[PDB]
Amino acid sequence: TVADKQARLMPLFKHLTALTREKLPLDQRDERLKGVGILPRGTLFSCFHARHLAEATELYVALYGAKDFNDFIHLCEQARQIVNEGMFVYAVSVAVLHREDCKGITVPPIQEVFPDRFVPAETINRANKEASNHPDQQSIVVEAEETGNILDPEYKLSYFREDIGINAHHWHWHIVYPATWNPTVMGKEKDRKGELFFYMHQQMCARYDSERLSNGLQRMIPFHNFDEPLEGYAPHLTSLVSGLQYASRPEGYSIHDLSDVDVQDMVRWRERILDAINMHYIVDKDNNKIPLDIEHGTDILGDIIESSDESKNVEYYGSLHNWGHVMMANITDPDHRFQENPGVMSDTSTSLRDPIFYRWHRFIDNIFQEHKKSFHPYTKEELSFPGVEVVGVSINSKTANVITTLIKESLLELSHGINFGTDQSVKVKYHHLDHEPFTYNIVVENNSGAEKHSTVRIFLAPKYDELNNKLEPDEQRRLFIELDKFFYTLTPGKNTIVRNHQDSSVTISKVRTFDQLGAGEGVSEDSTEYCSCGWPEHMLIPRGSHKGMEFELFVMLTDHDEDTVAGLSENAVCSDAVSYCGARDDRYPDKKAMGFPFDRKIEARTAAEFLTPNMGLTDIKIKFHG
Amino acid sequence: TVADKQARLMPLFKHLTALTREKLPLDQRDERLKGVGILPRGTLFSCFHARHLAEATELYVALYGAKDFNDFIHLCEQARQIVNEGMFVYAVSVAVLHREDCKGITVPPIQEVFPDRFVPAETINRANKEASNHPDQQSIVVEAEETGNILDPEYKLSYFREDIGINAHHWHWHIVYPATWNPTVMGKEKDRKGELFFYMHQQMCARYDSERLSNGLQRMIPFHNFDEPLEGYAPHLTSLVSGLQYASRPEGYSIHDLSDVDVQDMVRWRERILDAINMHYIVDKDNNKIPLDIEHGTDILGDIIESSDESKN
Amino acid sequence: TVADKQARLMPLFKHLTALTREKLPLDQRDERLKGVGILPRGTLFSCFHARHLAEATELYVALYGAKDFNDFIHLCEQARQIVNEGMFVYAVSVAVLHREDCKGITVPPIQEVFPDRFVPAETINRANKEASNHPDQQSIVVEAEETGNILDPEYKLSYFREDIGINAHHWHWHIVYPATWNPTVMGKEKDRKGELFFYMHQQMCARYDSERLSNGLQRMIPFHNFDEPLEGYAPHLTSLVSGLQYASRPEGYSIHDLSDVDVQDMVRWRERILDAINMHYIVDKDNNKIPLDIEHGTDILGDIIESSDESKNVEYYGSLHNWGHVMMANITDPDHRFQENPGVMSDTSTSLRDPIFYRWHRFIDNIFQEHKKSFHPYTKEELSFPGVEVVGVSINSKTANVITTLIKESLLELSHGINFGTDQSVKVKYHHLDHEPFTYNIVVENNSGAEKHSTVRIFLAPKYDELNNKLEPDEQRRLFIELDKFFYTLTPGKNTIVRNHQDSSVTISKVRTFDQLGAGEGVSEDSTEYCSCGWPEHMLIPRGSHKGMEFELFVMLTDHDEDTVAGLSENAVCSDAVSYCGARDDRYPDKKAMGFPFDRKIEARTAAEFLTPNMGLTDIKIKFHG
């Protein structure tokens, strides 16, 4: 049964660490992996580096190639033993997500699988220590929160950057859309992956910026100049696999060439990519030019920038984004002299924690923005949905139009990830931001005679700047974060549409634990999308401040008939989280450009001027509770 | 017997970290330590820093002060629970070395007490791992030698620099001649400690230079200029006591002021010292001048340079 | 200003224990004060006992018949020096609640004022100990949860019984409706206080029963026979004010005569009361008979049973309910030769914790029930609201029709209540039951031509019995708990009414901490009920079970025009919590008998048969998360 299948998968995931050591009387017995697994664990697996990605791709293909599920497990049994463990988790997760046979199946928790990435070394040490200190079945609980002389104000952001859910999501997203993805081999293609790459990262930056403003900090600035020294960050993460940890990066480093790539080769790529944007065409390998069409342009750019296998020219345009992660990651030891592990930037699970991440991503976002700039703005025609008027919006909470945010304690179970020994469970307690539940009530007047179908789009943007209160829509575009997108039908006359925050399309409703999975539930049975991906729920709104920071609440209704695509796909599957994740094996459900109406340049003075009749702005307050 | 005395002191020091948990409900209880009670347990202890040295000195004095050996064990037992462990090892070793009740009491070998300092993290966590991996009485053996790309020629010197014996010696030497040493309190004085300080360190450098030449490398150059950027070094050492490890340093960044001291001050101290050497006299606190005599000169300089408590100013 | 006034009140409340030492040269000057000061300071104050209440009333009056708010503060300040502290808190709170001058003003937290009543002795000891152990400004945190082997299944209920919010509410309720209340003196009268007395206590029992069933335990049985021995309970509460603690009770104790009252006159009173229900009339002091009218009957009975000052005959009918608390409280030392303190039963703040409370209250509830039995059942005419039909109800949560319940950690600040010394704050951490937020969507068809006004009444009742699944409406009456009551207007045609759990009329939205109160907010400024009274929010639904226990969700709509009373009262004041609390200085806003439709006997075998068109039952599940 499916349940049995789930059980088999969980053990593929257990003790990734320990299942190294060949355990193979003739070590040729997985010849398919004599080639792949040229990474022995020594350095860490890099999600960004090309060579690492190549190995990973090779692994996935074998998994995809597996004739049946049983064969799949057998490969994943015997092969795991040789290949680097990180690569293995990566390859398997991709396989589980896509391979039909796996119509059964969650992947074990990333946080749970590698607890060391989620929690600090101190807590991990303590738990391990307590386990040894007194042998006893009794459970061990450790509170990760610590006590420390906080000098840096960046620390304030830690609730966002360090959040477990955020890191997990980032890991999962890359799994759903792998850079290595080869559509020919799989046969299936990931719709608009390049564009999604752009959108997801942009949102992370946008959301990040809202945190800084909530904090009273200015918006992050891009890593425009390669010459500039980076700010330091020390992760305090250990790797349980061996003796090492992610290397910290002290203050103030100018940029060093790696054997693999020169930072100048990088600078070229940036010039090239941006050249083609202006010239409105890119050059394919064939030396043909493909236009940066309005429809296609973002996608093509996304593939080139990341870059994915899909890039029209890898050799010429290079892989700017990925190399950025690699270069930043080994700033400490570019030469590989000292033989030190890379920083957090190397891994999709960890990278969000470093503040540098935002600087780089804003830089890349800028590239996309230049392209967007080339496009013409939106006419009333494009925006408006005639006959429909938005009367008003209200947010209901304990206090209307105010959302309250607080910190909540939570526990993570280490036992699946690290050797438990005698203890039944070792849990680490951490705290994260959370908010009260709320609902939206939108009153819409349907002037038309017949029932209409509308897509409701809701975004949140900060009212205040770093200077004073100024709702300049051009700037707002960067800041706006997507709260929700959903379909509703309106009858003629007045209508009130109520939606609850829980329903939000952006967030993952729930991630099942190992324990949950061993049990056997039914959200449906889907895959790595399953509980993992989606933005985390606690994260839905920015922290705000004790004072109650003012944010613009924007609701827009668009003609659904226009917005939807027609086609024939599946049952109700992982679609909760469509806004950032997309739909399983389906085309992106919205015709509009991701981020619409915000994606193109706005001429207006105040945001308000921009509004059409099917748009509305309600100012609400977010107040944090200490 | 004295050997039974050994067998008690060695498990006093055995596994330092877990003997913390102070477990005395009222802070006031140890008025004996009301003067100190500043550096927590987990923190790294600095042999060089003045404040750390001051605490250490305070600890030793108590140990020296101990009326008898039994009393010595008692205060030590209880003090270890509260003070930082590194400081504790330092203070105790000094006490064992000097205090007359202790002849034929060797200390627990430093390498053995803190294996993590001697061996690389990879063979620390591999060994720890093997212990957990399969429970069994059986012995575990791990070969520290590793396998890796050896990019830096400095690596060649590792046999010398990394040597266990050398590191241990350096630890011990500082114990025999502590910077903090106050002759009035002890009553006894360490003959020519300043000069010895000079000689021992000079020999280490000299010996080091012979290694480089053996290697075919040029002799080491002095760090004369404060401005120059340092070469990086990554130790790959973990501190099991906590999660923490010694931070590595890459190369290429000029020198930064600490809250405790600014680099400019360091430069000053040097020009100060050079002048004194030059005019052949140093100024005491009393503002009297003492000559840099042929006999005395190295010793006086050693105390000032290190500097020890003995420094004239 | 009001804020200043608030500040003055908070210090009346501080260091009550310490406030003793009279420092008064002579009470004679305080002629007003002559009446009070009989009860000694250290002694425990009984809410219940008549003599104690009399002194308390005398004190309040002096505080009332102070001339302006300067005079009120003055006498209070002086009175607090001499009088027993417990009595003092009681008298002052009543004064703050009613006295106009106090149009300003919350009362300091009961939990916060007397932390020792809310938390266990161990935690309190630890905090006190930590304070002394190491002097330092640093904050102290203590987790009250403990570790112990728990032989007694009653322990399971502790989350309900021990809950801080519940105890606080009970304290506050008695303050709003004091037994001692003399309408002539105040001039104002408390509408339907006797009936409310009945309703509130009945609800507590009903809610309690739902917990037991959620637990898998049978419903509580009444203290029908006095001869029977009581089950023991040890509170583990200390009174810091002295060394003393609430005496524990070991099981196997039958009730003993006290000097104050012989258990038999209690038996007579109960018999006298029941006899006079049957006879349908009660005898007044005048020896006139007053009929137990349908309208009046519950109220008259409530006053007699409690009994309040309002009782038509105190001398003959006695005070059964109150004496029950007293007798149970000093079971350990009926003689008082031991000079031991009374148990938890003596105090309104503590009494809910003892399991005996339920047994006694069910007993008293039975008395009311017999009266209800005498009344005729409800015809379709009374129940139905014609033209209105309830199509369906749905509860929206993470999963529709399922409510999730979990345990949440919380902290209580001791500092206001006990001597802090050096420490900035000492907080004790405790855990309580809590549930996810949810909303209700009710579809109603308004057949009539015109808009109607309806009162929506929502109740929850357990589906399962101790036997097997049996929705026998007669039995259900005891179990049904009130979720919410609110007014809505329906237009003709289909209507959907959405209400959020947060809005619930039964619960207190928020209780302000002495810290919040230290600043100055604007919920508005009314008094002891302010944040205090109302049932606690976390408590709104029963725990349920991991399996997801089935509960009947009942929604009924009634004609509002009928339901409301007309009159002219205040601005928007403490009305959030109307269902159990009533409205400030206002008549109870609902004409229907409290608990309607559940109050009278139901002829039908099954609940479904009972339903009229304006009623509906939706089965939902409550599942607890471990």
From Swiss-Prot, chain B:
Three disulfide bonds are present. Cu cation 1 binds at H170, H174, H201. Hemolymph. It is found in: Secreted, Extracellular space. GO terms for cellular component: extracellular region. It comes from the Eukaryota. The keyword Oxidoreductase does not apply. One of its GO terms (molecular function) is copper ion binding. Keywords: Copper, Disulfide bond, Metal-binding, Oxygen transport, Phosphoprotein, Secreted, Transport. The keyword Phosphoprotein applies. The two copper ions bound each have 3 nitrogen ligands (presumably contributed by His residues) and share a bridging ligand (possibly contributed by a Tyr residue) in addition to binding oxygen. Hemocyanins are copper-containing oxygen carriers occurring freely dissolved in the hemolymph of many mollusks and arthropods. Belongs to the tyrosinase family. Hemocyanin subfamily. Scorpion hemocyanin is a 24-chain polymer with 8 different chains identified, assembled in hexameric substructures. This is Hemocyanin AA6 chain. It comes from Androctonus australis.
